[PDB]
Design an enzyme around this catalytic site. Structure first.
Site, mmCIF file in Angstrom:
data_model
loop_
_atom_site.group_PDB
_atom_site.id
_atom_site.type_symbol
_atom_site.label_atom_id
_atom_site.label_comp_id
_atom_site.label_asym_id
_atom_site.label_seq_id
_atom_site.Cartn_x
_atom_site.Cartn_y
_atom_site.Cartn_z
ATOM 1 N N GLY A 84 38.969 37.207 98.089
ATOM 2 C CA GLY A 84 38.448 38.263 97.236
ATOM 3 C C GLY A 84 37.159 38.146 96.458
ATOM 4 O O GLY A 84 36.858 37.077 95.899
ATOM 5 N N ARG A 109 30.630 20.375 81.814
ATOM 6 C CA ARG A 109 30.754 21.565 82.667
ATOM 7 C C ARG A 109 32.115 22.173 82.291
ATOM 8 O O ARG A 109 32.864 21.578 81.497
ATOM 9 C CB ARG A 109 30.607 21.306 84.188
ATOM 10 C CG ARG A 109 29.188 21.591 84.745
ATOM 11 C CD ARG A 109 29.235 22.210 86.147
ATOM 12 N NE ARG A 109 29.891 23.514 86.122
ATOM 13 C CZ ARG A 109 30.618 24.033 87.109
ATOM 14 N NH1 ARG A 109 30.786 23.372 88.255
ATOM 15 N NH2 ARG A 109 31.172 25.228 86.950
ATOM 16 N N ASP A 153 33.560 16.869 90.531
ATOM 17 C CA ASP A 153 34.528 17.523 89.684
ATOM 18 C C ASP A 153 35.618 16.759 88.970
ATOM 19 O O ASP A 153 35.956 17.080 87.838
ATOM 20 C CB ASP A 153 35.196 18.615 90.503
ATOM 21 C CG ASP A 153 34.238 19.707 90.880
ATOM 22 O OD1 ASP A 153 33.677 20.354 89.974
ATOM 23 O OD2 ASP A 153 34.025 19.926 92.083
ATOM 24 N N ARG A 154 36.187 15.760 89.630
ATOM 25 C CA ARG A 154 37.338 15.093 89.060
ATOM 26 C C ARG A 154 37.203 13.595 89.099
ATOM 27 O O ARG A 154 37.085 13.020 90.165
ATOM 28 C CB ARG A 154 38.560 15.527 89.871
ATOM 29 C CG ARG A 154 38.700 17.040 90.065
ATOM 30 C CD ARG A 154 39.908 17.382 90.962
ATOM 31 N NE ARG A 154 39.681 16.979 92.349
ATOM 32 C CZ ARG A 154 38.850 17.613 93.169
ATOM 33 N NH1 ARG A 154 38.212 18.698 92.759
ATOM 34 N NH2 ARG A 154 38.663 17.183 94.399
ATOM 35 N N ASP A 202 32.869 38.861 91.612
ATOM 36 C CA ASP A 202 32.895 37.434 91.878
ATOM 37 C C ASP A 202 31.495 37.047 92.393
ATOM 38 O O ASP A 202 30.560 37.852 92.329
ATOM 39 C CB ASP A 202 33.997 37.072 92.873
ATOM 40 C CG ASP A 202 34.508 35.642 92.680
ATOM 41 O OD1 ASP A 202 33.814 34.821 92.039
ATOM 42 O OD2 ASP A 202 35.609 35.330 93.174
ATOM 43 N N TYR A 248 30.039 29.659 85.131
ATOM 44 C CA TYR A 248 31.338 30.172 84.698
ATOM 45 C C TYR A 248 31.220 31.063 83.458
ATOM 46 O O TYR A 248 30.264 30.955 82.697
ATOM 47 C CB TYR A 248 32.253 28.997 84.359
ATOM 48 C CG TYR A 248 32.868 28.318 85.545
ATOM 49 C CD1 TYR A 248 32.332 28.458 86.835
ATOM 50 C CD2 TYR A 248 34.050 27.590 85.402
ATOM 51 C CE1 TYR A 248 32.967 27.889 87.940
ATOM 52 C CE2 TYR A 248 34.692 27.014 86.505
ATOM 53 C CZ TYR A 248 34.151 27.181 87.761
ATOM 54 O OH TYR A 248 34.822 26.661 88.832
HETATM 55 C C1 LIG Z 1 40.004 21.244 89.612
HETATM 56 C C2 LIG Z 1 38.560 21.477 90.076
HETATM 57 O O1 LIG Z 1 37.948 20.559 90.637
HETATM 58 N N1 LIG Z 1 38.030 22.682 89.875
HETATM 59 C C3 LIG Z 1 36.633 22.961 90.281
HETATM 60 C C4 LIG Z 1 36.589 24.281 91.055
HETATM 61 C C5 LIG Z 1 37.482 24.257 92.296
HETATM 62 O O2 LIG Z 1 37.092 23.200 93.146
HETATM 63 C C6 LIG Z 1 37.383 25.584 93.031
HETATM 64 O O3 LIG Z 1 38.005 26.433 92.164
HETATM 65 C C7 LIG Z 1 38.134 25.649 94.339
HETATM 66 O O4 LIG Z 1 39.438 25.233 94.190
HETATM 67 O O5 LIG Z 1 35.258 24.484 91.469
HETATM 68 C C8 LIG Z 1 34.265 24.514 90.486
HETATM 69 C C9 LIG Z 1 33.087 25.232 90.731
HETATM 70 O O6 LIG Z 1 32.130 25.211 89.930
HETATM 71 O O7 LIG Z 1 33.068 25.953 91.742
HETATM 72 C C10 LIG Z 1 34.492 23.848 89.304
HETATM 73 C C11 LIG Z 1 35.799 23.104 89.010
HETATM 74 N N2 LIG Z 1 35.423 21.807 88.468
HETATM 75 CA CA LIG Z 2 36.092 34.805 95.806
#
Ligand SMILES: CC(=O)N[C@H]1[C@H]([C@H](O)[C@H](O)CO)OC(C(=O)O)=C[C@@H]1N
Ligand SMILES: [Ca+2]
Ligand SMILES: *[C@@H]1O[C@H](CO)[C@@H](O[C@@H]2O[C@H](CO)[C@@H](O[C@@H]3O[C@H](CO[C@H]4O[C@H](CO)[C@@H](O)[C@H](O)[C@@H]4O)[C@@H](O)[C@H](O[C@H]4O[C@H](CO)[C@@H](O)[C@H](O)[C@@H]4O[C@H]4O[C@H](CO)[C@@H](O)[C@H](O)[C@@H]4O[C@H]4O[C@H](CO)[C@@H](O)[C@H](O)[C@@H]4O)[C@@H]3O)[C@H](O)[C@H]2NC(C)=O)[C@H](O)[C@H]1NC(C)=O
Ligand SMILES: *[C@@H]1O[C@H](CO)[C@@H](O[C@@H]2O[C@H](CO)[C@@H](O[C@@H]3O[C@H](CO[C@H]4O[C@H](CO)[C@@H](O)[C@H](O)[C@@H]4O)[C@@H](O)[C@H](O[C@H]4O[C@H](CO)[C@@H](O)[C@H](O)[C@@H]4O[C@H]4O[C@H](CO)[C@@H](O)[C@H](O)[C@@H]4O[C@H]4O[C@H](CO)[C@@H](O)[C@H](O)[C@@H]4O)[C@@H]3O)[C@H](O)[C@H]2NC(C)=O)[C@H](O)[C@H]1NC(C)=O
Ligand SMILES: *[C@@H]1O[C@H](CO)[C@@H](O[C@@H]2O[C@H](CO)[C@@H](O[C@@H]3O[C@H](CO[C@H]4O[C@H](CO)[C@@H](O)[C@H](O)[C@@H]4O)[C@@H](O)[C@H](O[C@H]4O[C@H](CO)[C@@H](O)[C@H](O)[C@@H]4O[C@H]4O[C@H](CO)[C@@H](O)[C@H](O)[C@@H]4O[C@H]4O[C@H](CO)[C@@H](O)[C@H](O)[C@@H]4O)[C@@H]3O)[C@H](O)[C@H]2NC(C)=O)[C@H](O)[C@H]1NC(C)=O
Ligand SMILES: *[C@@H]1O[C@H](CO)[C@@H](O[C@@H]2O[C@H](CO)[C@@H](O[C@@H]3O[C@H](CO[C@H]4O[C@H](CO)[C@@H](O)[C@H](O)[C@@H]4O)[C@@H](O)[C@H](O[C@H]4O[C@H](CO)[C@@H](O)[C@H](O)[C@@H]4O[C@H]4O[C@H](CO)[C@@H](O)[C@H](O)[C@@H]4O[C@H]4O[C@H](CO)[C@@H](O)[C@H](O)[C@@H]4O)[C@@H]3O)[C@H](O)[C@H]2NC(C)=O)[C@H](O)[C@H]1NC(C)=O
Ligand SMILES: *[C@@H]1O[C@H](CO)[C@@H](O[C@@H]2O[C@H](CO)[C@@H](O)[C@H](O)[C@H]2NC(C)=O)[C@H](O)[C@H]1NC(C)=O
Ligand SMILES: *[C@@H]1O[C@H](CO)[C@@H](O[C@@H]2O[C@H](CO)[C@@H](O)[C@H](O)[C@H]2NC(C)=O)[C@H](O)[C@H]1NC(C)=O
Ligand SMILES: CC(=O)N[C@H]1[C@H]([C@H](O)[C@H](O)CO)OC(C(=O)O)=C[C@@H]1N
Ligand SMILES: CC(=O)N[C@H]1[C@H]([C@H](O)[C@H](O)CO)OC(C(=O)O)=C[C@@H]1N
Ligand SMILES: CC(=O)N[C@H]1[C@H]([C@H](O)[C@H](O)CO)OC(C(=O)O)=C[C@@H]1N
Ligand SMILES: *[C@@H]1O[C@H](CO)[C@@H](O)[C@H](O)[C@H]1NC(C)=O
Ligand SMILES: [Ca+2]
Ligand SMILES: [Ca+2]
Ligand SMILES: [Ca+2]
Ligand SMILES: [Ca+2]
Lengths: 388, 388, 388, 388
Positions: A217, A37, A70-71, A244, A324
């Site tokens: 926004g 991703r 995500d992490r 957005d 994205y």
């Molecule tokens: C560092 C991190 O975890 N970034 C994630 C991002 C954020 O969580 C989001 O920008 C809100 O901070 O969300 C998304 C997402 O697809 O909405 C992906 C990113 N992996």
């Molecule tokens: Ca927004």
């Protein structure tokens, strides 16, 4: 050789032609393709490559279960040959982490990966494939960066980071690196109220970044950087053509210095090319989900609060998943102008397709043509049923 | 280094020796081999490689179902090392699309891929691995090209395109590219009534292309190009030894300037080496299907309407599947003459073998020998039953 | 750079150390490893690689059924990095065929592959990765060659071929190639009565080949070539330490100019280093089957008809399968002498292990040490039961 | 170019940042990853790579059964791109054997592999990818070496070997190699009573090695080598912060010249950076098993018998499996000091996780930062249940 300098202006964008597509999910149904991703594209003087954040497992592998997260300690920034899929055997790890950026300065490449728990993350800046600098979290709340390529000018490669809340004011910083070392950093200034995941490109010694205001926004914040003076400004795309997602329906007048309201605490990485009449905005078709993708020519979008589309091109049908999107250009191509390019992340799996337990994506990317080319739509192409 | 110039004449073709064979379908029964069709071979100054249009899925993958179809957003021109199979891990994407051509000019390579819906396709010409030029459909009816290598002389690389009907008069164009840019284009002229999928080779500053008249001809149209004057002519192979498929039985006299009748709206990409007495024609053995393959020496075939075979060599038995065939030569080999080579596409699966739901192929290729070598037949070699 | 010249004599062989082992069958039980046989090793100035004749299918693939057969249209000479297995993804095809040889002359490599039906085979000699010369069968009965590396001196690389019966007198020829072209060829001369699969090495401007007399001899024929005069002689290893397989028990006196009798129409490719007291013979332990492998120091074996072992080293236990063996040396290593090396083919599957339907092998190779090193045995290591 | 010289001192270690992680076991659950153990990292002037001892089988392959064993004929030292997993397709075999070391001297690399039965092993030293020297066992009891990179200075690369008992006095030797040839060797001297698996690094023309006393010591023996004088000394880390495993609880005073007692005949390869106040010790968290991993700053650990921690960083949680650990540095990086790095072997499978029949590992590695970075823990990440 010598550091690349942004000496050219953008080519006239009359349409978009197909540049690269890896069909990762389709192919990965029966081959060793890593789950990813947050992809992007970035060029070196002699080659252009696909990039993304691996999940440290293949799509068919049992460890694909849970990759909606995500992490984790199993992610890494990887790159692989243009239009190939990210496989276990052809992917090159640039660095370990869950948020990244990368760019070539003409001599060599700088890659940045951030890793850590939410309250103790740190970024490590690699240059020429070696770790050179480290920056500790300053707000103790998910230090994060672009998720697409940075841009360099005469050795100076600015990068935008954010640390702090995703639903309130945060601490955004612009670091100016040269050979992986910090020359200077500024706090964000201007009228942008929240910054995350900047998509940047450069032309005529100026770097433009279209980011995302996750907090309030639906219009996109824009940061313009002078890489020589190492200074910048910020505002929002004035246009009523909101870009957005999720977002409210388009008004007839946008906002130049405040987030356009209607949707809070959410958004998607996106981009734009802001060049007077030669301005093109990318966005999902759906105002509710990461569905579809189109490019809209909106002359003077950045500064005209009533600007509306004059031409357009559908990239992904609204009946197909997107995700994205970001900018990149081949700064080492022949010719008199820089050809604008972008990629769209085609997310498959969770959360929209929950019959499978994984989340991944494939990549489609386009670049501009001075011709008025016929359009096609470019979906991921995989059948989820096959993975069941 | 310097642009290659076609300064040599062809070597005397006394027989054909085995050059390359990838056994793709056999090997792919248990490894990550991409599904393909429309393959060819093409050389760079330092290496010769296999090329084809991937279907964006492996043969064993579930997405192989449906690959009988010709144009989808999941196809791409890929190249891979000589005689290896096209695997997910060793295939290099040249460009995205469903119809292509490619050739090295001595300095670098030009690759062309056409993509789009039937009424809005466009070609994008890549040079030195970068997109340089784009051409929009002019007849809004499946813009399509060679499906085998183009040929260059002093930087000029002519390419034949067709846009319009496959069963009536269409608009064929000859573009003369140099460094990926258009120097000039002509409409087709001469007596050829319909042109599709040209197979070309060059010798002594002249480029000869043996194409296919899908509409009416069972004899093959031939386009001869002068890459310096950037002009050309067209006619049909005069010989009664008919080389398209399906086709009627051989007559005793052929046609020089009109399609030889008997079969409409169908055909197969094929080729020939037209060099006076040193003339060799390739063709399927079957007059009804893409079955078998043989090379026939037919002295003066191009200009003699009663020319018949004087020697021959079986390549694929009539009890084995064949397919497309085309020409290529290693213009960078040692010696005083260019050694004629060709490949035959060995199609497996649909429509002939419908117990499987996919369509793919393997490649066999030969080059000429001045010796009178013994012959062998070269089948695909895979057992369809294994895939069931 | 410049053509390599055999200016050094052999290093003193006091023992053998482990050089390379790919464990192909073990690893291939669960990965994309090609089925092979007839392997060897050969060096380029900058790298040494494993070579073999692929069967055009993986071991686990369904097409592995039937690979006990020797000559099919699906075989090819492939090379791959030292000690890796021959996989679909890392194997480089040198040429198409079922019998081969290959060697680097210091500037570039020459590879020869023979293909065809039994009565119409032909060899095609590739040089610098291009086909240069072709030779048609002269006896119409399985034209065949070394199955191990050839050796070059000042550009001249002699190769031994045989065409005709395997159980009666045949027509053996020694071709002297230079840059892939034929400088000269001789018929076999000397007292060797039958020649097949020569294993060669060179030292001090002389090339020694230990071949096999399939027809009548249990002792090995030896061909010594002068690559400058382009002339040669032939005889048999005089020693009573018999080295073919199957073979009768060792006598106390061997034969210098006639095959040693006891076993007809059978044998195995083998080799030896004949260098006065520094003479070492390789052979299977079993006198009945391709089982086990040992090196025996037999001072003056070539010329002393009563020579017996003075030292030895077991390579493969008699309770493990062996196969073909041959010589190679890294002519581009540092030092004052050439270090003798050899490989042993470890055959698995048919005909000895018929519970599986395939036949393949792995490679083990050793080189000499001036030290008196401890010995280990080196078996293939795979469990056939796992493949059931 | 020129031989590298250890002209720099260590950078100040204020914390550790993430350098590389391959997630081998996770990814290998569904891809062709070789089973390994005894990994390390080592740099060349232009690239840094992961190294390990393969078991000659994939994790999912049936031959993975039994890989808990240490020495077989199917092991080999392999290297592969940084942070990738060791796959069948990307792994490069350096040499055959079950114990190894490797290091680049600035011009080219030297790799050493030992193979053989317990009473007849031998080491073969490769230089520039060729075998150059061989050393026979001198104690006939498992000749063994570092299991991590050696270090060079002006062409001289010292290596520590041990032959003899693992539970009593043995014969340890320090060999000084140059271009793969033996310049000199010494018997171990100093107060270290038993030496095994030394982890070394160099700075300011001195090479420091932190090894393991398998026989009696829970504190680590340290060998300091002068690569110019080709002499050395030995002692133990004086600190009460004990770093072997298993080990007794930390006392308040350690031992400088004798093993610290409490645990016999066992231990784990480990390492340390001994640089006055800039001293950091690595160790498992568990005093009983290879569980967890942490770095502890223990100023003057080598010489102060009451030194205790002043700072620390957890690398692997005690609820996660660890294993061997060792030192390496990129001696070819930019800057004024050498950045200390280390890797930790994350063992999975037997003996701790016996529901599976194999034993393998993944790699995590860190390097120092002059910053005080936030910490994360880095576990292997694989779920054993998936392999059942
Ligand atoms: C560092 C991190 O975890 N970034 C994630 C991002 C954020 O969580 C989001 O920008 C809100 O901070 O969300 C998304 C997402 O697809 O909405 C992906 C990113 N992996
Ligand atoms: Ca927004
Ligand atoms: C072969 O290929 C060629 C080349 O691609 C094809 O030709 C192209 O055809 C495209 C489709 O028609 C066309 O794209 C459109 O261009 C419009 C602009 O051109 C028109 O207006 C200008 C200006 O006056 C004229 O000069 C010109 O002559 C045209 O008349 C855009 O306006 C179009 O985008 C809008 O419509 C699409 C749906 O079609 C929306 O998805 C898009 O978002 C735009 O509409 C929304 O946004 C606007 C602005 O706020 C709103 O006003 C509007 O109501 C919509 O708002 C709703 O929807 C959005 C998105 O969901 C939501 O957020 C919001 O809340 C509302 O709900 C479109 O871009 C190409 O320009 C044209 N190219 C060329 C070179 O000609 C050709 O057809 C093909 N041939 C065949 C045979 O197929
Ligand atoms: C070892 O290797 C060597 C080297 O390969 C082998 O020797 C080769 O053997 C080949 C097979 O015999 C041979 O190939 C043939 O050559 C013929 C030409 O030579 C003969 O005529 C000339 C001219 O007079 C003489 O000088 C010469 O001495 C010979 O006598 C060709 O005519 C042959 O092709 C025709 O037959 C084959 C079937 O064998 C057809 O498939 C082929 O298409 C040709 O026939 C069709 O087309 C013609 C022309 O229109 C029609 O007239 C004819 O009726 C056929 O038409 C039907 O079939 C076609 C195709 O299906 C269909 O479209 C049409 O409608 C009709 O239905 C053939 O090419 C090599 O030249 C020869 N090489 C050498 C160097 O000698 C040797 O045998 C091997 N050894 C062993 C032991 O096996
Ligand atoms: C650690 O490592 C070291 C280094 O490897 C180990 O030491 C090595 O040990 C090896 C095994 O002993 C040894 O190898 C043997 O060397 C013999 C020669 O040395 C002896 O004779 C000389 C000459 O007089 C003396 O100077 C010397 O001191 C010794 O006494 C060979 O003769 C041995 O080969 C023969 O035996 C083996 C079985 O052991 C057969 O397989 C082999 O084929 C030889 O025997 C057959 O062939 C001869 C000749 O025709 C026949 O006469 C004899 O009857 C056999 O014939 C039958 O078998 C063959 C084959 O099947 C068949 O075809 C035929 O028809 C008959 O049926 C053997 O090579 C190393 O030289 C020695 N190395 C060193 C440096 O010392 C050490 O042991 C290891 N340590 C530990 C603790 O394990
Ligand atoms: C964000 O990131 C930052 C950066 O990492 C985080 O801050 C770090 O936090 C770490 C954890 O607190 C901290 O690490 C510790 O440092 C201690 C030293 O600092 C303290 O003492 C000095 C000296 O007086 C003071 O100057 C300083 O101000 C501090 O007060 C170490 O002592 C710690 O290690 C000891 O504890 C751990 C458990 O925490 C043990 O695992 C470890 O082995 C040490 O303790 C054993 O060993 C000692 C010595 O013999 C024994 O005395 C003791 O009893 C323990 O012995 C038992 O356990 C061992 C191991 O199992 C066994 O063998 C033995 O037999 C006994 O059973 C620890 O290393 C970092 O230094 C600190 N970094 C920085 C820059 O600040 C921050 O917290 C994070 N933020 C958030 C929000 O999470
Ligand atoms: C980008 O701009 C800088 C000038 O700012 C160029 O740098 C000069 O390059 C030449 C040749 O390397 C040197 O002699 C000058 O001193 C360089 N630098 C400076 C900072 O003055 C650089 O060459 C330009 N890049 C390219 C590709 O032309
Ligand atoms: C490491 O130190 C040695 C000196 O000990 C350097 O060696 C000298 O290098 C130059 C250039 O190659 C030669 O002309 C000298 O004779 C070399 N050697 C000796 C032994 O005197 C070497 O260059 C140094 N390495 C580096 C990277 O600077
Ligand atoms: C662009 C395109 O789809 N070309 C296809 C070709 C044409 O359909 C045929 O030439 C008629 O136009 O047919 C065939 C074919 O095998 O007959 C293959 C090509 N994929
Ligand atoms: C060309 C050819 O088929 N050579 C084969 C060889 C011969 O059949 C044998 O030497 C007798 O001629 O046998 C063997 C063999 O293992 O005995 C292997 C070779 N593949
Ligand atoms: C050569 C050899 O087998 N070395 C092994 C090592 C030794 O067995 C141990 O150091 C005692 O000698 O143990 C271990 C171990 O994990 O404890 C790993 C090594 N493979
Ligand atoms: C995936 O993980 C979830 C949550 O742990 C579990 O319930 C689910 O059953 C898993 N699905 C599969 C296919 O493993
Ligand atoms: Ca697989
Ligand atoms: Ca036709
Ligand atoms: Ca025999
Ligand atoms: Ca211990």
């Amino acid at each position: 050789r010598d550091f690349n300098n942004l000496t050219k202006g953008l080519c006239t964008i009359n349409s978009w032609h197909i540049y690269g597509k890896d069909n990762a999910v389709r192919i990965g149904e029966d081959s060793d393709v890593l789950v990813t991703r947050e992809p992007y594209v970035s060029c070196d003087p002699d080659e252009c490559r696909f990039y993304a954040l691996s999940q440290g497992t293949t799509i068919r592998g049992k460890h694909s279960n849970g990759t909606i997260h995500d992490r984790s300690q199993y992610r890494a920034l990887i790159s692989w040959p243009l239009s190939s899929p990210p496989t276990v055997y052809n992917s090159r790890v640039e660095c370990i982490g869950w948020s990244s950026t990368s760019c070539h300065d003409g001599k060599t490449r700088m890659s940045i990966c951030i890793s850590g728990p939410n309250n103790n993350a740190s970024a490590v800046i690699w240059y020429n494939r070696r770790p050179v600098t480290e920056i500790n979290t300053w707000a103790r709340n998910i230090l994060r960066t672009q998720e697409s390529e940075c841009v360099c000018h005469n050795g100076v490669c600015p990068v935008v980071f954010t640390d702090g809340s995703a639903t309130g004011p945060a601490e955004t910083r612009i670091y100016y690196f040269k050979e992986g070392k910090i020359l200077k950093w500024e706090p964000l200034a201007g009228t942008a109220k929240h910054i995350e995941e900047c998509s940047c490109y450069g032309e005529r010694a100026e770097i433009t970044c279209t980011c995302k205001d996750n907090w309030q926004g639906s219009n996109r914040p824009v940061i313009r950087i002078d890489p020589v003076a190492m200074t910048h400004t910020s505002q929002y795309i004035c246009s009523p053509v909101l870009t957005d997602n999720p977002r409210p329906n388009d008004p007839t007048v946008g906002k130049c210095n405040d987030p356009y309201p209607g949707n809070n605490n959410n958004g998607v990485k996106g981009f734009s090319y802001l060049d007077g009449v030669n301005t093109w905005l990318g966005r999902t078709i759906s105002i509710a989900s990461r569905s579809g993708y189109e490019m809209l020519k909106v002359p003077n979008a950045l500064t005209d609060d009533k600007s509306k589309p004059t031409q357009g091109q559908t990239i992904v049908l609204n009946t197909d998943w997107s995700g994205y999107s970001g900018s990149f250009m081949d700064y080492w191509a022949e010719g008199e102008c820089y050809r604008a390019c972008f990629y769209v992340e085609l997310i498959r799996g969770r959360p929209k397709e929950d019959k499978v337990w994984w989340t991944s994506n494939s990549i489609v990317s386009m670049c501009s043509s001075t011709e008025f080319l016929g359009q096609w739509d470019w979906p991921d192409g995989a059948k989820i049923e096959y993975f069941l």
